[PDB]
Write an enzyme that holds these catalytic residues in place. Structure first.
Site, mmCIF file in Angstrom:
data_model
loop_
_atom_site.group_PDB
_atom_site.id
_atom_site.type_symbol
_atom_site.label_atom_id
_atom_site.label_comp_id
_atom_site.label_asym_id
_atom_site.label_seq_id
_atom_site.Cartn_x
_atom_site.Cartn_y
_atom_site.Cartn_z
ATOM 1 N N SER A 148 20.587 87.866 -56.173
ATOM 2 C CA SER A 148 21.078 87.260 -54.938
ATOM 3 C C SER A 148 22.603 87.157 -54.929
ATOM 4 O O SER A 148 23.276 88.184 -54.981
ATOM 5 C CB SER A 148 20.416 85.898 -54.733
ATOM 6 N N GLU A 199 11.418 89.238 -49.189
ATOM 7 C CA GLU A 199 12.763 88.691 -49.327
ATOM 8 C C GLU A 199 13.029 87.534 -48.377
ATOM 9 O O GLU A 199 13.850 86.651 -48.687
ATOM 10 C CB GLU A 199 13.797 89.799 -49.114
ATOM 11 N N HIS A 222 11.989 85.698 -52.599
ATOM 12 C CA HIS A 222 13.327 85.839 -53.162
ATOM 13 C C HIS A 222 13.457 85.034 -54.448
ATOM 14 O O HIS A 222 13.235 83.817 -54.451
ATOM 15 C CB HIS A 222 14.320 85.327 -52.119
#
Ligand SMILES: NC(=O)c1cc[n+](CCCn2ccnc2/C=N/O)cc1
Ligand SMILES: NC(=O)c1cc[n+](CCCn2ccnc2/C=N/O)cc1
Lengths: 540, 540
Positions: B200, B331, B444
């Site tokens: 990320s 995601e 995520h």
């Protein structure tokens, strides 16, 4: 071995603890069980009396805090953390506390019973600011405080249903009052002289007990600090309570997809959820962006309250009752940083006119545009309509008058006119140690530490004048609990506190200066809230 | 004492600690200082190297977490609290960690350097999910990870000024990479073979170091897991950065009215505030309601980045670079419970059409109505335009494609077409222990625990197949760190992972099944985000 720390009550034996104050010891019995733990199938149900126990229950420390939202708006900040839980959360939380002088009184003694506030969604009897040791030492009364269920656990209501009737947090308080009737004598306390006092939602609770016949026989006087049962936030209607309970159910997956949603199935599904899961979705059921509004509050359903608090206050006969009521100087300011645009506790909050006008809709939610215009009219200084400091003080007055000062003035006059002896105050001293910003003045809740004598704590940094001040206030409160009258039966020299009457509307200012008599609890503003604004809604 | 827990580096001597794994011990040096504490006058300034020290610095435990917002959306929930600080907060936080095999390698060994994500506002190298012990034991690599400043402390930027130039958190990361160059040999690590990996905002960081010439010589390979520097959330413009810093200053009373204004006065007033006071207003400077947007992120100002990441990616020559990039299956899903209407982790989040349309504006903030209409066109199934489950999955796709998948695919193709050898994956296994709801799929961040081998932790309850799967993944990552190629150097049995190319766009699925080759990283959706929607914004 101090025998005064050992006591028997109807359910069994207890061991307490000796607490020190600079003036001498006090005996405390902390964490007494008064109800069966309201868990499992008992979630949302009226409390049941605690079955007797064998052995000695340890009553040397506070018990668990009832499950509740925890304020995280300002981590580490004293101004908010002082209200947050200071013991673990549990649904096993129906315990009460007793402070009694040392040596134990030999003659029955007047009892003060504290009901904490917290908007019906938070609060605990164990908070440091509710420490009964200094009051019991200084005035040699008996002090009781109880935990009661808050949030959905205390006040989720599917009206009509047996499984979630509503108002069970108020029943928790009642059960504790029945407990005081049956056991306080064992501590040297006089069950024929019980004075309820409470702040904010605890004041609303005290008032609801005035208006409920089953509770009214359990006490003799009442103190309502910064709150009233007729507040726009203090009660909620059957339809709106059911809508809130149903949305809470939806947010936690109840009822599972394809399953019926009658009240039995809904509560049963709710009863399977972890308590924290319920807590985590509580704020998400309020109908609109607001301040000073709380999701799960007492419901007007014909049971605990046979009619609205407004109806019951108007029709009531209060002969034989003494009431002490009051407000702080700046009732509204604290709530503005929880949603009013442009407000921050870490700056001066000098809002613009646009922010003020948006704030009025957050501070007075669910009213027509014409009503909001009427609010803006009364609260704008038309010679300085855009001066930010005046706008900040004005929105503070809007929220405080609407939510606290005018519901209290309303109640105070109806009580005085219909039989009660009423005393009224405005609390105007800002603690030297207050951690909120100066512009908030004397916020909601910041007389409590003086009523409980916290300035006498040797570990704190209050001034010498604030200690004298605190002693003055504890004397007032104890005089009222003993005699129904805060004035000293022995000091004709000290300036007097005259009763409050629907006509003269007299009240006193409480600060470091001697008592000062004033007239009218914001009479002009409260005439707008209490007389005009309702008519305005009827003609929409 | 064991000899290999004692090590000397350029600044002084260290004592490490032995960590157990089921396969044997590892030597860890936790909490090595690499910078002077960025406190007081050093707040907002680039880091300074840590001056050498006398004696033995204890490197047996993690040091403090950099000051940061703490997630309270779900108190006690494992899914969020796994990311929250697990050491106390301090501005004195610039420490790094070195894990090394036991016994210590005798020939230089490839170095993996972890950069954590957390939207540039949160994160710590001490989190349990970044425990480097299993990777180092299983694959006999050296592993480094550093803390870097996040939120305002790392990325508040008044562009131009010397007092708060921005990007200092990226400078913290670079200083740590300079430290690996100068000292990792002392642990048996090979400074000529350094692979950065990050997830990320850490992947965006890895990407920023590719595009910054001073950083680019400190390493040789790159792994970007679920993030890219060209993401719409990953950088901010000079004017918007200045606007956010100035509003933060205002929210905390800077400058004191009305004295002050220029950048010197603003930063000086900010430096007098308690760190927690800055943290408490961080979210209130974002321009609108949004998900997947963060207040203080890298600023494009001409210094650390001579141009936008998009411009530098398009112009760059990437010959000699090997990159591994990839995404998880879902995601977007994590972010929807942080603002999209109708979403809740505790129900099925079966949203209505209305909710989906409002969600698009939250998930794609600051775009024209026509742009939102284009998003709705592309993401509606017009045979089922109102089916709640399809709409829930579609908004998840909107947020994930826009913020992660299509910025990564874009970077991947430009790198491969411009000289880099690129490998790409989609991570498709949902942990057996995952605490988020099933509708979120593979959210995520939930490949990280498999890359670090956390399933091997005997105190955890992963399945036997997940342990094998974890070992397969650690092999891929280490193989790529050693050779630049995730494929087993000789093994012809195992299926092959082919490079990603701007033409064939081949990638592999990582799950319990053997590798499967696929083509196109959401090629049609990413053509909408990467090719059309820009042209749609150009002609407003
Ligand atoms: N929207 C949110 O996340 C939220 C945060 C904090 N709160 C605490 C409300 C505090 N409050 C507001 C008005 N009056 C009070 C408390 N009185 O004691 C509520 C909601
Ligand atoms: N002060 C607040 O009420 C508040 C608002 C938004 N957030 C955002 C939470 C984190 N988040 C949102 C979107 N993506 C993320 C985390 N990414 O790692 C936190 C707190």
């Amino acid at each position: 071995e101090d025998a005064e720390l050992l006591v028997t009550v109807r359910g069994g034996r207890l061991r307490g603890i000796r607490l020190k104050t600079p003036g001498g010891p006090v005996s405390a019995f902390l964490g007494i069980p008064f109800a069966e733990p309201p868990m499992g199938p008992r979630r949302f149900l009226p409390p049941e009396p605690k079955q007797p126990w064998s052995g000695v229950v340890d009553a040397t420390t506070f018990q668990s805090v009832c499950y509740q939202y925890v304020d995280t708006l300002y981590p580490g900040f004293e101004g908010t953390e002082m209200w947050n839980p200071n013991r673990e959360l549990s649904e096993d939380c129906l315990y009460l506390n007793v402070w009694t002088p040392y040596p134990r009184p030999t003659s029955p003694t007047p009892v003060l019973v504290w009901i904490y506030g917290g908007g019906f969604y938070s609060g605990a009897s164990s908070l440091d600011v509710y420490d009964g040791r200094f009051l019991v030492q200084a005035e040699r009364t008996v002090l009781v405080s109880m935990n009661y269920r808050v949030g959905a656990f205390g006040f989720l209501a599917l009206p009509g249903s047996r499984e979630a009737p509503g108002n069970v947090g108020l029943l928790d308080q009642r059960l504790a009052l029945q407990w005081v009737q049956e056991n306080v004598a064992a501590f040297g306390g006089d069950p024929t002289s019980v004075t309820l006092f409470g702040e904010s939602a605890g004041a609303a609770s005290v008032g609801m007990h005035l208006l409920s016949p089953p509770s009214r026989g359990l006490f003799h006087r009442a103190v309502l600090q910064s709150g009233a049962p007729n507040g726009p936030w203090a009660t909620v209607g059957m339809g709106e309570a059911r809508r809130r309970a149903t949305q809470l159910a939806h947010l936690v997956g109840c009822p599972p997809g394809g399953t019926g949603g009658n009240d039995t199935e809904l509560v049963a599904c709710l009863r399977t959820r972890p308590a924290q899961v319920l807590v985590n979705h509580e704020w998400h059921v309020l109908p609109q962006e607001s301040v000073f509004r709380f999701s799960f509050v007492p419901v007007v359903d014909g049971d605990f309250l046979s009619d609205t608090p407004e109806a019951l206050i108007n029709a009531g006969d209060f002969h034989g009752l003494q009431v002490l009521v009051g407000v702080v100087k700046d009732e509204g300011s604290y709530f503005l940083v929880y949603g009013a645009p442009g407000f921050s506790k870490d700056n001066e909050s000098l809002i613009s006119r646009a922010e003020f006008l948006a704030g009025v809709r957050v501070g007075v939610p669910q009213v027509s545009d014409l009503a909001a215009e009427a609010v803006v009219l009364h609260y704008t200084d038309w010679l300085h309509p855009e001066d930010p400091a005046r706008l900040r003080e004005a929105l503070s007055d809007v929220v405080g008058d609407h939510n606290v000062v005018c519901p209290v003035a309303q109640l105070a006059g109806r009580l005085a006119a219909q039989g009660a002896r009423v005393y009224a105050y405005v609390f105007e001293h800002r603690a030297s140690t207050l951690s909120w910003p100066l512009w908030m003045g004397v916020p909601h809740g910041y007389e409590i530490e003086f009523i409980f004598g916290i300035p006498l704590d040797p570990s704190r940094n209050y001034t010498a004048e604030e200690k004298i001040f605190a002693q003055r206030l504890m004397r007032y409160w104890a005089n009222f609990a003993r005699t129904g009258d805060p004035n000293e039966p022995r000091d004709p020299k000290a300036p007097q506190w005259p009763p409050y009457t629907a006509g003269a509307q007299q009240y006193v200012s409480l600060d470091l200066r001697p008592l000062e008599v004033r007239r009218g609890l914001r009479a002009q503003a409260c005439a707008f809230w209490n007389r005009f604004l309702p008519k305005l809604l009827s003609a929409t």
